[PDB]
């Protein structure tokens, strides 16, 4: 399967940027090295959030999985309540705990 999106974890205290590919289906974000998008940092929940992608040409849906430190949309600033679906927009900035990320749609 070719990736259809990217999650960019920006550079920070943890070192240079890390880029994670996003595929059709369930892409789990969490600390567990099993996760599709493994962010191995103590403040990230073991199962933190899920990005669900139904097709290359459909917006991903992000949901927080009841994480301890939350998932936020950076701009406009919002807290995502557990279990509520949010459609991701290309270039949208997301916080998983204190880790800023950016979602990019790929082509095609």
């Amino acid at each position: 399967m070719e990736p259809i999106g990217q999650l960019r974890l920006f550079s920070g205290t943890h070192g240079p940027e890390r880029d994670f590919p996003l595929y059709l289906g369930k892409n789990v974000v969490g600390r567990s090295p099993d996760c599709s998008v493994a962010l191995p940092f103590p403040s990230i929940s073991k199962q933190h959030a899920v990005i669900e992608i139904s097709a290359w040409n459909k917006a991903p849906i992000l949901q927080d999985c009841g994480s301890l430190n939350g998932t936020q949309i950076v701009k406009p600033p919002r807290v995502l309540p557990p279990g509520v679906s949010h459609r991701l927009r290309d270039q949208e900035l997301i916080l998983f705990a204190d880790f800023p990320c950016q979602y990019h749609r790929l082509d095609v």
């Binding site: 103590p42 403040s43 430190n69 204190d98």
Partner: peptide, 8 residues
Amino acid sequence: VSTQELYS
């Protein structure tokens, strides 16, 4: 290990 809470 459980998740570390963020505080100050």
